[PDB]
Homo-oligomer: 67 residues x 6
């Protein structure tokens, strides 16, 4: 595959503001600083570590290309 890495890499490279919705409906915002297979580092005031198992959808704030 796989689809995650190029999607997230594009967001990180272009420094696209994103909305990350968590499995509880709470929305987080910022720019994807780095990621691996378990977490995303989400930046603005501080870097916060978001567990992928808690994420429902990642929504870019503007159209982003990759594949």
């Amino acid at each position: 595959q796989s689809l995650q890495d190029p999607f997230l890499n594009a967001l990180r490279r272009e420094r696209v503001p994103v909305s990350i919705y968590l499995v509880n409906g709470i929305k987080l915002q910022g720019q994807i600083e780095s990621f691996d297979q378990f977490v995303i580092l989400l930046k603005n005031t501080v870097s916060q570590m978001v567990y992928k198992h808690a994420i429902s959808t990642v929504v870019p704030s503007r159209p982003v290309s990759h594949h």
Copy 2:
């Protein structure tokens, strides 16, 4: 098997609008752009990346065949 891939492939191929309900009850809509074993790319204004672990049911907006 397996049932997922042909179901999602049919939706993607026929460009069938779908409703994706997440484990928190929130409903997402659009067309399935691509998928793998971990995420679905869901399109309309922007492509958003939906984690399969956060999805409860995928509901096509009209009858779709595959198997």
Copy 3:
């Protein structure tokens, strides 16, 4: 084992209407069209694909035998 397959197979074979409760408390209804180890295809108007990780309990609408 295992208990899942004969329980779900019986429901599918006898075309027993079932209630599927999801981990968020939302109830889905219909007849089990097919399943594997990851999803259930639940039919009535359209087939919808239900992720087993999102299901809490499967409730037949009438007594069903298998084992």
Copy 4:
């Protein structure tokens, strides 16, 4: 190990009414008919299949011994 099997086996053998609380706070009741590593069959009017990943706690309605 392991602790699950003797606890659930005792409940099943003694036909002890149990309360099964699901991860969403909904309470189910009945007697444990059978189980494996993925589901519990919970009986009263009909047998319902409860996914262990959706269960939070199993509460016997009276003191039960095993180990």
Copy 5:
């Protein structure tokens, strides 16, 4: 490692009353009777079996040492 076993073992040995918060926000209380890698047996009136996948945090009711 690992951190779980000595933390839970200390609680069990010292028979420290604990609060177990579940992933849905519901609080359970009692003393940890036994545990393994999948469940905790939580005692007071009856022993109840708590699935670790449903637990969010284990809060001792008083300071407990181990490591």
Copy 6:
């Protein structure tokens, strides 16, 4: 990789107060005492054991460096 360990190690070393949001929206606070791949020990009055599967995001109360 991997990103978790250096992020959490920095927080633990610098004894940075953190907010840990759980998958249910409840916020926990304190200082990260120790962690492994399954839990975080979160300190203030008592040490509490937080299951990583129940955590959504870890938010430092001030900017923290590592990588």
